Design a protein around this ligand. Structure first.
Ligand SMILES: *[C@@H]1O[C@H](CO)[C@@H](O[C@@H]2O[C@H](CO)[C@@H](O[C@@H]3O[C@H](CO[C@@H]4O[C@H](CO)[C@@H](O)[C@H](O)[C@@H]4O)[C@@H](O)[C@H](O[C@@H]4O[C@H](CO)[C@@H](O)[C@H](O)[C@@H]4O)[C@@H]3O)[C@H](O)[C@H]2NC(C)=O)[C@H](O)[C@H]1NC(C)=O
Ligand SMILES: *[C@@H]1O[C@H](CO)[C@@H](O[C@@H]2O[C@H](CO)[C@@H](O[C@@H]3O[C@H](CO)[C@@H](O)[C@H](O)[C@@H]3O)[C@H](O)[C@H]2NC(C)=O)[C@H](O)[C@H]1NC(C)=O
Ligand SMILES: *[C@@H]1O[C@H](CO)[C@@H](O[C@@H]2O[C@H](CO)[C@@H](O[C@@H]3O[C@H](CO)[C@@H](O)[C@H](O)[C@@H]3O)[C@H](O)[C@H]2NC(C)=O)[C@H](O)[C@H]1NC(C)=O
Ligand SMILES: *[C@@H]1O[C@H](CO)[C@@H](O[C@@H]2O[C@H](CO)[C@@H](O[C@@H]3O[C@H](CO)[C@@H](O)[C@H](O)[C@@H]3O)[C@H](O)[C@H]2NC(C)=O)[C@H](O)[C@H]1NC(C)=O
Ligand SMILES: *[C@@H]1O[C@H](CO)[C@@H](O[C@@H]2O[C@H](CO)[C@@H](O[C@@H]3O[C@H](CO)[C@@H](O)[C@H](O)[C@@H]3O)[C@H](O)[C@H]2NC(C)=O)[C@H](O)[C@H]1NC(C)=O
Ligand SMILES: *[C@@H]1O[C@H](CO)[C@@H](O[C@@H]2O[C@H](CO)[C@@H](O)[C@H](O)[C@H]2NC(C)=O)[C@H](O)[C@H]1NC(C)=O
Ligand SMILES: *[C@@H]1O[C@H](CO)[C@@H](O)[C@H](O)[C@H]1NC(C)=O
Length: 1323
């Protein structure tokens, strides 16, 4: 409406429409003394063929509506209808505009090469093309205002802006920068338009990003507290190397002052085991590493990790690496190196950082993306809604037709394939001569069947008609390329014809049900999907070519700061590297690039790989979840019976009861809590050896009675029946076997007795939340295993591909200490086996299908897929040796995998898990009848109204001038200004470097002294004022402790420490105050809007927190009795083992997010060495666990990284959707709170009334939309406001009346009666 009004005004008012370009015609507004072709209204045709065209255009417009016109608007100064006008007309019309795009696409193909041809001459061409074009557009429209409008309308912003700089670049200073080359390429962001609709998504990401601007102001604070924490805990913790002491009475030193600081400073003796290029962080808080013997562990000695840029000291680095954590990225180092350093207690920090920041604040962005995406599609549905509304031969033929119809044919068809699928499904490297010949026989047999089935159908029914069915068209395309296949391999050459065998595999979709369904919905977005796709490449391409010319000539020139290497594998030299390195950062690892970039490239790289992360991953790759979500929304007869009643009242009586029931649950806990402290060290000196064995017997004594009393009490028929009572019977089974082997026998079957842990489940669902989350898991799992059947399927395609070209390779020559030699000594399996030595494999190969399958999953979840992908590049024949650079075009094989694997399927687990979780909230709280999303809003408002009664208003004790104190405690001066002090106290901590002069130390000591005195005043003025309402007041309790500890700290003095304080918690409690601010944010109301959200979720969000704690505790104990001694090589550093119960959780929180599960897998799949465990005197158990691993990690990553950690996401995006939902319609919770705030003001003594005369003021004292501003008497008098004598009004009459107003002030129509009905019901 507003837009329309604006348009009308311009038609009026003081803009001019110069031309309207419509359907290849430029129709011509002029000049209020002067014309050209004003009329008709109506489909006339006054003049002319031009006239006719105009008429046609008009007609089209009337049909259509707005669509589509190109408006050039005008005055302004000059130009009536010769030369400028003509020019304008030319520009309006569209094939020219098609031109400039081309010269745009021509630059892209020209820029992507290298430098090569120096046509700078051809470079000079395209500028002059655009120099003309910069001229046409400013000539069309006008003059100084419209260069001011040419600034203005913003796609055009980029055509001027960039091309001045492209004009600048001819200008020559070769002085300073070559940044002129930098921003040249941005031109190609035009090319989005091309392709077709273009508009929800470009307009998605535009509405995606400028809503997130609010939210960014959150996390820029959100990071800034924790990087402080890291600064303040972790400062120069992350430099503990391990240094020797002395030759004591030896050779070096005496007086240990200027030489002990010298003998430790030299980087020649501190510990390295075997060239692990960096330096091996140590510890000496117990548990946390250490470090081998004759040593000790010092802090401040040279360097720090990856390339000097990990550590938490010096604030600005502490920002980057903490922001690493919120990304959840390669932290497998920054995990471990910290715990080698400090201790195994500091995951309690890393839970905060990862749990609180990056499990919230990466969802909060997805929250914004999906909301902004849905808001534009429903906006785009309005266009979608409006535009819609001989005899023998004959007999034979008949027979053929019959067989086509039959239950015969498709069956045997679907047989032949599930068999043919199986023939391609072997393709070994070894593949015995007889096996090879079998396989070759397989296809000539099976290819003929295809032609026959195909040759007969076409003949059985109707040629021209036969090509109506696309599947039969698809069926025909098989055997055309099948008969292609055969000739090449008669003929002799070549190669790629073979993989069109894999086009067969698709034939299966028609025979499926679930899969024709799945393939069908994407045939809904042949468009939306590929449009989303096209920008993802474009944005990335935009960053690819700016990366090359920008970082660029640094990799080749410097060349030597790298770890004694010439170039790394992920550089910025050509396009394909510089496309791959930017794509690597999109999926998201982006540090190891950005070490590698900044090490050599000085500064400017830091903005670039954060700009590829936000704009790349959190904006695009969360958008691609919103695409899948909006598309895939789919006497003894009585006496024994009296005993049978006595057993019914023994059991059914005793059974419902809490007091036994909790007695069972408590026991399962402390029995399983005993089960934690088992292993390696049980045989420690056998107090637990014995009780773990007592608890063994006396548990099974409790489980067999458990089983009687449940057996008889509830239900014979339905006890043997259902699932959670199955898991009991099977425990009781299971502990029955062990007794069975205490005498007649003997061993403990260990794993039988570990299904005791399995029953802790159903205390857990009962807990005061998980009822929601549980119901959403065990419901999920049917639809999950529907996706998975699918997700096999595409991987099944991609795998057997990679066998047909990958299989056989991955066999590099190696001397025993692992060195790929290089070349020239190597290049076949002869010259490495003819010398003597060891032509050996890489552990994640593509030899089999299951070997190729698992090794594809490492590139699925982006772990260890650098390490595959280098070897994959390098390999170039079956029995020859792989070389470092060659065969790099098939590094694009992964890109056609990683899209159709990782973003389209691995994130499709999210678009199941959100669709289920909205429904389970409906069956908690709600219904399924409303279903149109408004009635439910109304009901929730009604329930919110019914809720609150009032504050007390902590109302005064009397005096001395104690009264003063409460005149300042509640004031709006003191809370700001004392709070303002807390933000001051923060920024103190922000200044601090490592070890820093005393000069700085004296200052911070001085300033810390100041602030606590003011705080000590804050406390007692706060204390004397409210006193007990202090402690109903959460922050102040915290605000109280840090004060008290400060007096503990600084006051008496110390002596000694520990025995109270020490410096961790003192500073921790000081930082925890700064979260007082979320109270104070109420300013711009989109950001307090979303944080109300967070609390609405946190209690269900803690609940999911517990399952993750739990199925950790599950799989640690269950793995632990699997994963006793197993070497170590390569991510169980002999501190991060499955040995104890501590590290088994330290391990698995790494695996929780699935960061570093390859190198973990590589240990538990390591089969080389072993001394076979004898179960005798002796054994070194340190041996192996293949099948015991695959069925563990894959059973972990599906459970943790797929469902439950995305279940984490489904909670936040439900609630944050619900909240913007209310706000749109509606009435958030903030509003209700502010109402009672101001109600308290007017009703201090919580009488729950208010006087007649004060009502008007109360209606004035509210925030919109509840607020009825003065004058308001005539409006109030409108609402139903009953008064009790004498002239008092009750609150909820007021609440009801006021809230009923607002939905009025919102709306009209039919909701309202619904609302009324709801109210009535409530009453
Ligand atoms: C746990 O880990 C911590 C580190 O986080 C270890 O702490 C280290 O402990 C070492 C002893 O076990 C300390 O060595 C001492 O360090 C003194 C440092 O000297 C100062 O240097 C400044 C710099 O200019 C000088 O101005 C000062 O004047 C100091 O001299 C050595 O001087 C000291 O040498 C001894 O001194 C005594 C007198 O006190 C002599 O009689 C004796 O003959 C010997 O020369 C001594 O070597 C080390 O500094 C300390 N780390 C830090 C960063 O301070 C813990 O030891 C670890 N836990 C365990 C149980 O080992
Ligand atoms: C640990 O102490 C030793 C000596 O106890 C230090 O050795 C120093 O080694 C340097 C070699 O680089 C010697 O170089 C001298 O430098 C000056 C100025 O560059 C020059 O004029 C001399 O002709 C000579 O080249 C130096 O003599 C020697 N120091 C002493 C006191 O003799 C070593 O540097 C110490 N380690 C660390 C990490 O400081
Ligand atoms: C760090 O420690 C290493 C050894 O732990 C030091 O290397 C040593 O450097 C000294 C000179 O400072 C060398 O002494 C020289 O010996 C040769 C004969 O071998 C003689 O021709 C010279 O006149 C001089 O005396 C010593 O050989 C060398 N040893 C080793 C094993 O490398 C290094 O200097 C230390 N650096 C710092 C900064 O402390
Ligand atoms: C195992 O890996 C390392 C390379 O990463 C190599 O170990 C080195 O092996 C040599 C003997 O082959 C050790 O002895 C050295 O021999 C040279 C003469 O060639 C002599 O000048 C030295 O004083 C020393 O005696 C050498 O210490 C050792 N390196 C280390 C750091 O311990 C080796 O190439 C690999 N093994 C095989 C079989 O290739
Ligand atoms: C590494 O490969 C070389 C060959 O490239 C192997 O050397 C060969 O070793 C065998 C037995 O050790 C030698 O055969 C016998 O040698 C004795 C002399 O000791 C001779 O009297 C016999 O008549 C018989 O020929 C063979 O000559 C020798 N060849 C060469 C060229 O040295 C070696 O065994 C391989 N080592 C490993 C660890 O694989
Ligand atoms: C470390 O330095 C001290 C410096 O005093 C050495 O002590 C001297 O040692 C010599 C012989 O080694 C004696 O003749 C002196 O009398 C000692 N000085 C004193 C004050 O007693 C000490 O020997 C040195 N340590 C080593 C291992 O050489
Ligand atoms: C290469 O390997 C084949 C394997 O049969 C062998 O016969 C041949 O002699 C080898 N050639 C060289 C040059 O080592």
């Amino acid at each position: 409406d507003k837009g329309r009004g604006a348009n009308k005004d311009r038609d009026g008012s003081a803009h001019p429409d110069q031309a309207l370009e419509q359907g290849s015609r430029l129709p011509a507004r002029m000049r209020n003394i002067f014309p050209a072709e004003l009329a008709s209204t109506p489909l006339e045709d006054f003049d002319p063929f031009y006239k006719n065209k105009k008429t046609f255009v008009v007609v089209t417009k009337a049909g259509d509506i707005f669509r589509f016109s190109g408006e050039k608007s005008l005055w302004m100064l000059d130009p009536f209808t010769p030369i400028r006008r003509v020019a304008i007309s030319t520009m309006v019309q569209p094939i020219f505009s098609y031109f400039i795009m081309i010269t745009i696409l021509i630059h892209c193909i020209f820029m992507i090469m290298p430098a090569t041809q120096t046509t700078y001459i051809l470079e000079l061409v395209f500028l002059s093309i655009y120099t003309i074009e910069v001229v046409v557009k400013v000539l069309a429209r006008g003059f100084i205002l419209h260069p001011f409008a040419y600034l203005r309308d913003p796609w055009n912003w980029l055509d001027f802006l960039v091309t001045l700089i492209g004009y600048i670049t001819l200008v020559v200073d070769l002085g300073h920068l070559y940044a002129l080359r930098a921003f040249r390429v941005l031109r190609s962001w035009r090319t989005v338009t091309i392709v077709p609709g273009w508009r929800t998504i470009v307009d998605a990401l535009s509405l995606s990003i400028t809503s997130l601007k609010d939210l960014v102001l959150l996390l820029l604070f959100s990071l800034f507290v924790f990087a402080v924490l890291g600064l303040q805990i972790y400062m120069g913790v992350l430099t503990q190397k391990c240094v020797k002491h002395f030759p004591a009475d030896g050779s070096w030193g005496n007086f240990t002052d200027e030489r002990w600081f010298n003998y430790t400073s030299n980087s020649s003796h501190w510990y390295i085991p075997d060239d692990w290029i960096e330096y091996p962080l140590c510890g000496n808080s117990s548990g946390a590493g250490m470090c081998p013997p004759g040593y000790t562990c010092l802090q401040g000695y040279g360097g720090n990790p990856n390339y000097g840029y990990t550590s938490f000291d010096t604030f600005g680095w502490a920002f980057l690496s903490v922001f690493r954590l919120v990304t959840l990225d390669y932290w497998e180092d920054l995990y471990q190196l910290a715990l080698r350093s400090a201790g195994p207690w500091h995951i309690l920090f890393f839970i905060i950082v990862v749990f609180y920041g990056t499990f919230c604040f990466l969802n909060f962005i997805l929250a914004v993306v999906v909301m902004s995406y849905t808001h534009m599609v429903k906006r785009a549905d309005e266009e979608k809604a409006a535009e819609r509304e001989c005899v023998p031969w004959q007999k034979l033929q008949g027979a053929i037709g019959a067989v086509v119809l039959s239950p015969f044919f498709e069956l045997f068809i679907a047989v032949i394939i599930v068999l043919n699928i199986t023939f391609m499904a072997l393709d070994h490297h070894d593949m015995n001569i007889e096996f090879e010949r079998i396989l070759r026989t397989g296809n000539y047999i099976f290819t003929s069947i295809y032609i026959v089935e195909a040759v007969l159908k076409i003949i059985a029914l109707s040629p021209k008609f036969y090509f109506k069915d696309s599947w039969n068209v698809f069926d025909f395309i098989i055997v055309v390329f099948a008969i292609l296949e055969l000739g090449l391999e008669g003929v002799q050459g070549l190669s790629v014809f073979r993989s069109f065998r894999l086009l067969r595999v698709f034939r299966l979709a028609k025979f499926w049900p679930t899969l024709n369904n799945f393939m069908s919905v994407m045939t809904k977005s042949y468009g939306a999907f590929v449009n989303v796709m096209y920008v993802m490449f474009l944005l990335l391409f935009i960053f690819a070519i700016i990366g090359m010319q920008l970082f660029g000539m640094n990799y080749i020139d410097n060349m030597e700061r790298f770890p004694d290497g010439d170039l790394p594998r992920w550089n910025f030299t050509d396009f394909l590297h510089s496309f791959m390195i930017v794509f690597r950062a999109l999926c998201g690892e982006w540090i190891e690039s950005m070490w590698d970039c900044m090490l050599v490239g000085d500064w400017s790289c830091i903005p670039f790989f954060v700009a590829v992360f936000f704009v790349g991953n959190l904006v695009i790759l969360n958008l691609l979840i919103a695409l899948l979500l909006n598309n895939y929304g789919s006497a003894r007869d009585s006496s024994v019976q009296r005993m049978w009643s006595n057993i019914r009242r023994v059991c059914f009586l005793l059974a419902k009861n809490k007091y036994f029931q909790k007695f069972v649950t408590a026991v399962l806990v402390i029995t399983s809590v005993l089960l934690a402290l088992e292993d390696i060290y049980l045989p420690q000196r056998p107090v637990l050896v014995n009780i773990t064995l007592y608890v063994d017997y006396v548990l099974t004594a409790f489980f067999v009675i458990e089983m009687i009393i449940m057996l008889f009490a509830v239900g014979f028929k339905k006890y043997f029946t259902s699932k959670w009572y199955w898991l009991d019977f099977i425990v009781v089974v299971a502990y029955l076997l062990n007794f069975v082997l205490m005498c007649a026998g003997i061993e403990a079957l260990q794993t039988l007795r570990l299904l005791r842990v399995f029953r802790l489940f159903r205390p857990l669902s009962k807990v005061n939340g998980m009822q929601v989350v549980t119901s959403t898991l065990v419901e999920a799992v049917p639809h999950i295993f529907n996706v998975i059947l699918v997700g096999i399927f595409f991987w099944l395609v991609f795998a057997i591909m990679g066998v047909q070209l990958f299989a056989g390779k991955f066999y590099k020559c190696v001397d025993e200490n692992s060195t790929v030699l290089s070349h020239e000594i190597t290049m076949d399996r002869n010259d490495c086996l003819h010398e003597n030595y060891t032509w050996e494999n890489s552990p994640m190969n593509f030899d089999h299908v299951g070997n190729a399958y698992l090794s594809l999953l490492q590139v699925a979840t982006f772990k260890g897929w650098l390490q595959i992908m280098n070897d994959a590049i390098d390999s170039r024949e079956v029995h020859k040796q792989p070389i470092r650079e060659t065969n790099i075009y098939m590094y694009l094989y992964f890109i056609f995998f990683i899209v159709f694997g990782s973003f389209f399927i691995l994130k499709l687990f999210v678009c199941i898990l959100i669709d289920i979780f909205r429904q389970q909230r409906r069956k908690a709280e709600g219904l399924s009848a409303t279903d149109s999303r408004t009635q439910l809003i109304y009901r929730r408002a009604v329930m919110r109204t019914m809720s609150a009664k009032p504050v007390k208003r902590i109302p005064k004790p009397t005096c001395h001038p104690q009264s003063l104190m409460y005149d300042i405690s509640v004031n709006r001066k003191f809370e700001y200004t004392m709070m303002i002090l807390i933000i001051l106290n923060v920024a103190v901590m922000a200044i601090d470097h490592y070890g820093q002069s005393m000069e700085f130390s004296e200052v911070l000591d001085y300033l810390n002294l100041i602030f606590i005195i003011i705080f000590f005043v804050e406390c007692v003025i706060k204390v004397s004022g409210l006193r007990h309402h202090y402690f109903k007041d959460p922050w102040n309790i915290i605000d109280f402790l840090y004060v008290v500890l400060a007096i503990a700290g600084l006051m008496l003095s110390d002596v000694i420490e520990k025995y109270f304080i020490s410096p961790t918690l003192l500073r921790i409690l000081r930082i925890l105050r700064v979260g007082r601010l979320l109270r104070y944010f109420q300013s711009a109301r989109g950001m307090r809007l979303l944080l109300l959200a967070l609390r609405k979720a946190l209690r269900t969000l803690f609940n999911v927190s517990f399952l993750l704690f739990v199925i950790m505790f599950v799989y640690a104990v269950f793995g632990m009795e699997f994963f006793m001694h197993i070497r170590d090589a390569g991510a169980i550093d002999d501190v991060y083992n499955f040995k104890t119960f501590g590290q088994s959780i330290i391990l698995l929180f790494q695996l929780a997010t699935s960061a570093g599960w390859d190198g973990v897998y590589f240990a538990i799949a390591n089969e080389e060495d072993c001394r076979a465990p004898d179960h005798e005197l002796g054994y070194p158990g340190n041996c192996g666990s293949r099948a015991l691993g695959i069925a563990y990690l894959v059973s972990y990553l599906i459970i943790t990284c797929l469902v439950v950690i995305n279940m984490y996401a489904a909670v936040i995006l439900d609630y944050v959707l619900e909240v913007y939902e209310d706000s749109k319609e509606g009435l958030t919770d903030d509003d209700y709170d502010m109402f009672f705030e101001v109600w308290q003001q007017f009703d201090p003594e919580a009488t729950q009334y208010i006087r007649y005369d004060q009502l008007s003021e109360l209606l004035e004292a509210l925030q919109p939309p509840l607020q009825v501003q003065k004058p308001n008497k005539y409006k109030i008098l409108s609402m139903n406001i009953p008064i009790c004598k004498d002239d008092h009004i009750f609150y909820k009459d007021v609440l009801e009346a006021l809230v009923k107003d607002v939905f009025s002030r919102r709306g009209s129509p039919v909701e309202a009666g619904d609302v009324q009905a709801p109210n009535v019901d409530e009453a």
